[PDB]
Design a protein around this ligand. Structure first.
Ligand SMILES: NCCSc1ncn[nH]1
Ligand SMILES: NCCSc1ncn[nH]1
Ligand SMILES: NCCSc1ncn[nH]1
Ligand SMILES: NCCSc1ncn[nH]1
Ligand SMILES: NCCSc1ncn[nH]1
Ligand SMILES: NCCSc1ncn[nH]1
Ligand SMILES: [Cl-]
Ligand SMILES: [Cl-]
Ligand SMILES: [Cl-]
Ligand SMILES: [Cl-]
Ligand SMILES: [Cl-]
Ligand SMILES: [Cl-]
Ligand SMILES: [Cl-]
Ligand SMILES: [Cl-]
Ligand SMILES: [Mn+2]
Ligand SMILES: [Mn+2]
Ligand SMILES: [Mn+2]
Ligand SMILES: [Mn+2]
Ligand SMILES: [Mn+2]
Ligand SMILES: [Mn+2]
Ligand SMILES: [Mn+2]
Ligand SMILES: [Mn+2]
Ligand SMILES: [Mn+2]
Ligand SMILES: [Mn+2]
Ligand SMILES: [Mn+2]
Ligand SMILES: [Mn+2]
Lengths: 190, 190, 190, 190, 190, 190
């Protein structure tokens, strides 16, 4: 009913997305960027989407092309699956407490791309989240939200009210976007 | 069930309001102030009210007396139609993204008039929205929210978190108020 | 189903709490601190809890030990009654207008204690609310929210956006927490 | 070869665009907003496009819906007519002196919507250009550039280095965008 | 006609460059520093050079010696291939929009080495671009432009007007230099 | 075709100008002010004009009357030789790197005299360039650009982005103006 399959093959990367808006949080994400997988898994889950994301890309350069291409493909999928947008809440918002962090997100499935990203502390624009694999530069948080909004053709406002930990700040943001989308895509009983 | 018809005849103007709180967004507004009609139409619509507004007034002087008298009559109608306020959510709030603008509104159908209007950029206190008809001075936004709160006997808090375009800032505010009212007037299942 | 009875006997005080999360606002509070009773009654009521609170303590010293011990016992009760936390909204938030005051609260029933208390004007850290009985020092607002979060094992973020009256600022906060809890403990249909 | 016809009918307005990128400046614009017609005529002309723009809309409210809808339809047309974007310069830029004003524009026909609008003096965010017809609020300059970039799927950077007259500042900007587009859409001999 | 082959063997590294100024963007770069390869590939491509770069070096220490030695060898090649500099445009410049970033570059193939690097945000002087291989410290951007200018014996001015993402800021700069070189090396018809 | 001969005899000086816009840089300048000759030679050359300038004047007072009268006569010549201005690019601009200096110039052969001169460091308004002959006060740079624009009836914007050496700052400016004129006077193929 509200499903979309997107394939996006560039010189930089290969993306397959399968998205059902009316899911139960059945989510599997594999981008080669494990922190990004964790964020996109928290997004799909907290949005009660069924989401499959399979991505390979030029992670020898860094995560950027794969992160952006995935966010672009995911946006296209959200847009396609929404279709005519008949009888939906359309507007949604969500606060996400995560220990010391508070994030907020607000959406208008308007058909008019716009992203406003505010309140993220300045140290996130050169912070790295690094494990045993390909690292995640938090400077990309904004890039992900803008790419998502641009390609889904929605108004997305993402706010950090406050926070310290870059992992908490990033996850709370992805989760805020997720629960804001969840409210907005729900059928409107009126 | 939750309907009210208000007639308000002053030396300055003539207002007829018909309001059903349990509507499907069937809205018709004619004040002689076309931007005001657009705002009151977005309010009635986004609140899922059925709303009729018919107003004539001294627009040769300017929109002010007609805008205020309409907002006063509309408040009286909201108050009357709410009646005893038994079993309603009572509290409501809504974020409205509109491109670069973010507006918020929060209501307590408390029975105690109060309006707090914050965050509206200072250029709105001398900005004009002008077409081929009677213009709308955005300095009146506040006046409209105060008149509404005063005559509905509710607590209304309207916030501009940020924004640039005076049309976006004004509409987002009217829409925020609308969706906050919509949540608050809904039957409370508990 | 989601009920808990907590008894907490210290050298300082004696607390009995009976809490049903799936209540209809049937609330009775008696701490010997009448303003505190009013706040805990507004919390239980606005959360649609059924809540009984019976507390006696060393109010000859002042309200502090009784207020804290009650908040601790209440948290333990909220935590116990929540149990496994299966199928709940988990996240909740609420704006509370109260005349000139606007308060906000956001919860994650995460299982990870955290409290962030922001925006409360500085005069509240030495303000007294005094009647014909034991007075309430508003400096304790924070202490109550921290004790609640610590013992329920939840993330609680409480914000005063603005306000002047210490009674309005305090009640709006307790009410915000209540409606945020109410949303978060509701069954999640997905 | 590089032509597109766009029809955009909303509740607010009706737009017909016919655009040839390989034109000789044969341009006719009729929006009901005469200053906007002058700007879109200078854009089509200075870009050496052949451009027809026919628009009717709710100018009784003000120019905004008609201006935005036209800019949206024009962007869609630019995007469609560009097609595969094979063998074009792709990047373009232009300085426009206009008496005391200096404007600049830079484009990447990247396929990735982005607009950056900088240097416009603050008085333009509440300035009106008014004649015998429907007026033009210069606050809309930005809205036009963003809508254009969003719907053509291009990177558009528009800069006011300096200027005083709102007519000079606005026209120089439209002309800068035009000559930047003209360079970028030219066949690349390599 | 305008070709050069440079071999540069130091204790630190081994470089082979083959450069044709009159190319069609046939570019292959392998330095062991994959982000650097991406930047030098965007430079060769956007300059319509045919460029081969093969480099091995002490990347166990870090990318610096290999990045610098390559930039030095590339400069020597640009200088040699330019020869007498008869009948060329000599001056070139280019703006590069890249999402939020705007970069500019201006060249005088003067025969007089000079580099001015301005506007790069301060976080780039300790930012890392890290993938699955050898990382790239953006502090080296300047070093690359200076080495290039020093060894090609040209005036190179590289400017960041604004930008946030370190990947966008760096690539836009390399691309600006490329398109500025492309204009300047073109035959001058006069 | 695009040639002009101007004679200007005042009490202060005698000027003969012969100007061909479609030249090959065949330039001869003799004003009695050798630095001025060098600047006007770089202007004629870099503009691909054929230019003859012969001037005698009251250099016992200082260079000013001769410099201004020459700039006036040169402007008259540029204006006359341009004639109807049919089928020309009309707009032109050029960046000039000169070691540490960056200058820019932008022209609109609009028929409407205007000069904006910005960014020149303050020490140039009392700096002297002195050899074995009549010296050149750099305070006259502005006077030359204004006289040129006034008498050619063009919009001339001259900018120093930065620089230190007064010889580099002055020459880069004259060269910027020259290459901006060269682009603008070229036949427009469309
Ligand atoms: N995928 C290539 C165009 S977008 C980009 N962002 C960073 N580098 N390239
Ligand atoms: N272990 C999951 C809940 S706590 C957390 N901190 C960072 N991410 N998640
Ligand atoms: N009388 C109850 C509503 S108004 C109020 N002010 C302080 N507490 N309540
Ligand atoms: N065309 C309606 C959606 S966009 C808008 N801008 C101003 N009002 N509405
Ligand atoms: N008359 C056209 C050239 S001058 C101008 N000022 C404002 N617009 N155009
Ligand atoms: N020798 C000519 C190129 S370098 C220079 N410095 C000052 N004028 N020219
Ligand atoms: Cl989680
Ligand atoms: Cl709408
Ligand atoms: Cl109450
Ligand atoms: Cl908020
Ligand atoms: Cl014109
Ligand atoms: Cl590219
Ligand atoms: Cl030279
Ligand atoms: Cl510039
Ligand atoms: Mn990118
Ligand atoms: Mn995590
Ligand atoms: Mn009034
Ligand atoms: Mn509107
Ligand atoms: Mn204590
Ligand atoms: Mn009270
Ligand atoms: Mn708009
Ligand atoms: Mn004009
Ligand atoms: Mn070095
Ligand atoms: Mn890249
Ligand atoms: Mn003079
Ligand atoms: Mn010189």
């Amino acid at each position: 009913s509200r499903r979309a399959r997107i394939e996006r093959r560039t010189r930089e990367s290969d993306i397959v997305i399968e998205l059902d808006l009316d899911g139960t949080g059945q989510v599997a994400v594999d981008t080669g960027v494990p922190f990004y997988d964790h964020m996109l898994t928290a997004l799909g889950s907290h949005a009660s989407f069924d989401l499959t994301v399979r991505a390979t890309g030029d992670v020898e350069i860094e995560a950027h092309h794969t992160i952006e291409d995935t966010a672009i493909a995911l946006g296209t999928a959200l847009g396609q699956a929404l279709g005519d947008k008949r009888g939906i809440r359309r507007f949604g918002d969500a606060f996400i407490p995560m220990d010391e962090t508070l994030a907020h997100a607000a959406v208008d499935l308007s058909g008019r791309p716009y992203c406003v990203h505010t309140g993220e502390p300045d140290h996130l624009q050169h912070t790295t989240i690094a494990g045993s694999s390909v690292p995640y530069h938090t400077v990309i948080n904004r890039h992900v939200f803008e790419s998502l909004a641009a390609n889904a053709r929605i108004a997305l406002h993402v706010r950090v009210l406050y926070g310290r930990d870059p992992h908490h700040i990033t996850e709370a943001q992805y989760k805020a976007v997720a629960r804001a989308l969840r409210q907005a895509v729900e059928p409107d009983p009126r």
